[PDB]
Design a protein around this ligand. Sequence first.
Ligand SMILES: *[C@@H]1O[C@H](CO)[C@@H](O)[C@H](O)[C@H]1NC(C)=O
Length: 475
Amino acid sequence: SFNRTSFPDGFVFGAASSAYQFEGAAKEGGKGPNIWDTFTHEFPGKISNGSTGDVADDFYHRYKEDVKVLKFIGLDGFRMSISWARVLPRGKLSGGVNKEGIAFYNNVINDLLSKGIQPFITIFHWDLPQALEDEYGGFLSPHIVNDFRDFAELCFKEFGDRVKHWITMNEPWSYSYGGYDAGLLAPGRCSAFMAFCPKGNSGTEPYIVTHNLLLSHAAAVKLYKEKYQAYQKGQIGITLVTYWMIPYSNSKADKDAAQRALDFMYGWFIEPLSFGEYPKSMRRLVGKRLPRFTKEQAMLVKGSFDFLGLNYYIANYVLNVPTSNSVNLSYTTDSLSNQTAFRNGVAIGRPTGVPAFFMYPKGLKDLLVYTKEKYNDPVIYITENGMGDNNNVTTEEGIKDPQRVYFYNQHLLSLKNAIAAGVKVKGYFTWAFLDNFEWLSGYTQRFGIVYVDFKDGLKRYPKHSALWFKKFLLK
Ligand SMILES: *[C@@H]1O[C@H](CO)[C@@H](O)[C@H](O)[C@H]1NC(C)=O
């Protein structure tokens, strides 16, 4: 049977989570407010069912039992994030450290390590303290960099003796696009012509924010390398998400469109991280709306990772979009490309419970080989991979998830192929550990290998996928 022995010795298999999506205790334990507390409460129409992460999975209180479930599955690693406003309630270091917040993360880490599970810790998973958003507009401002650095340093100082894998941030594409182009994610900003957000500019702010995300990342990495890595002996990277782009047709127009789509989503980050420069297509199409790295900034950002985390979910077909005389100016329309999961009406792969998301396991290897070939064979972790069910069956039926067993079998086979093609993948994390608060989708989508019965006291039930993973892991 297909099992972990097919993967390199010491390969890390894990499951993933994040703080706002799992913890709850949003106003407890000394925690201060973050932009997702604010967003979910002030824009309920932007979350399915007007849900919040006020309680989520209550991982804050239930972590001891959840860590037992991780051990039961037999996982090697666990991805989790630090809630910035839980440890620094006013965002700034001078605003004071919340000892009870530090204590929570220490408790989780110590329990994880006692079970032989390596913590892979994301420093920033979108839950910016409201205090920083209010003071200077969060990642719209160059001021964010040094507050981010202090936050990262707090983490290194308090946890780095035990944590040996750091991720500066998760999916800065999602933060920038979702938060500042489409206004679908906190802090919920977009152009006035969209009649969807009170403030913003979809044609400028995504580029401003991405620049500052990259600079904040780079500052944290520099600090880790110079002050902590030699003694703590850990590794630091960053997690990027991209869809794999397939040309809608064999035309040059569609081939080019597919690459532009990949440039704007993926290259936007990985080309600065690899080359110290933005993609040529973005320089060309976005022009002076796209910030330039100074010589010093380029040197700081280029090479600023020990490993690359990749989140992979889907592939899309891409169509060329001709220029117009009608300027709905936005990051989204800048790429002159249109993504669709359908060619001639037929989906790109097996359906899932999520309408836009189809199964395309080939695209994981395709992405990995592309990354190897373009960005100098980096060390890679698959930091997220998974699928969602719709939340409208019973607990007993929700636990039976052969479609997710299928999903993981196919993607791990594809991952095995990528490794055999020479891609330096060192680990793999399922999104998600638990069914959780899936941002704008609230609790309508279930990505977990463990079922959470939100209607019955948040009870945990391992799904068939979790039991399959347990068998796969020889545990
Ligand atoms: C796991 O896979 C290997 C192939 O690499 C096989 O030799 C071994 O018997 C398998 N173990 C199981 C299925 O328990």
